[PDB]
Design a protein around this ligand. Sequence first.
Ligand code: SF4
Length: 85
Amino acid sequence: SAPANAVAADDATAIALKYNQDATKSERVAAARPGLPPEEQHCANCQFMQADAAGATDEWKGCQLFPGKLINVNGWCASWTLKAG
Ligand code: SF4
């Protein structure tokens, strides 16, 4: 269920991050960051992605240093880094 403080695909911060809510429609494949292959890359397994951030819902969690807002686990951004990679 979408929080009010959802990071929208079209968020200004999202744009800066080249975030997508749905990683299967991210440029992640083009970016092909190291860690794991692009299709496995999403906020779900992003290095400093936090469940602990409060406000976090069903699909929605705290990204790294994305204050106030919550990203969708299924999403991705240019900063994506594996949990220990
Ligand atoms: S840094 Fe990670 S958790 Fe945050 S938006 Fe990017 S991929 Fe998602």
